Design a binder for this molecule. Structure first.
Ligand SMILES: [Cl-]
Ligand SMILES: [Cl-]
Ligand SMILES: [K+]
Length: 164
């Protein structure tokens, strides 16, 4: 298991524009296009992202290309954030992947706001962090995924993604 495999499990792979859990147009491996309610708008972001006139459908290679960029951007976002970085730096590799996962899903700014959980994580108070993490809109709206990620932070193992 690794961050790419992990996120591939959590985000799926769809080659045509579709609506994510929040109703926003997305494509590929969780690549958010826009929060706009306009499909045309989404198409336009897609073409720009890929560099060609696609009309809503891309290839697997194209999907993976955005995914690579998106994973890199999540990492870069963590490293650039004064709240996130210290946390990430304090973590082991498996847990680092859990944080990358959350940032990919919610964005840098979003995760940066989980002040208390962040603190518990830095303190290495695993069980407490986990309880804290679950007290969130995130957990409530995507509970199975959230549970996976929380288990990962709890345990520092890939048990939640094992056998999937
Ligand atoms: Cl992009
Ligand atoms: Cl879920
Ligand atoms: K998805």
């Amino acid at each position: 298991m690794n961050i790419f495999e992990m996120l591939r499990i959590d985000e799926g792979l769809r080659l045509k524009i579709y609506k994510d859990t929040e109703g926003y147009y997305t494509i590929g491996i969780g690549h958010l296009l826009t929060k706009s309610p306009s499909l045309n708008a989404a198409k336009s972001e897609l073409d720009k992202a890929i560099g060609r006139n696609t009309n809503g459908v891309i290839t697997k290679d194209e999907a993976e290309k955005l995914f690579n960029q998106d994973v890199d951007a999540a990492v870069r976002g963590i490293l650039r954030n004064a709240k996130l970085k210290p946390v990430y730096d304090s973590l082991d590799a498996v847990r680092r992947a859990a944080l990358i996962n959350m940032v990919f899903q919610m964005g840098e700014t979003g995760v940066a706001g989980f002040t208390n959980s962040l603190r518990m994580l830095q303190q290495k108070r695993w069980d407490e962090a986990a309880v804290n993490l679950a007290k969130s809109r995130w957990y409530n709206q995507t509970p199975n995924r959230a549970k996976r990620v929380i288990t990962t932070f709890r345990t520092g193992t890939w048990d939640a993604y094992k056998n999937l």
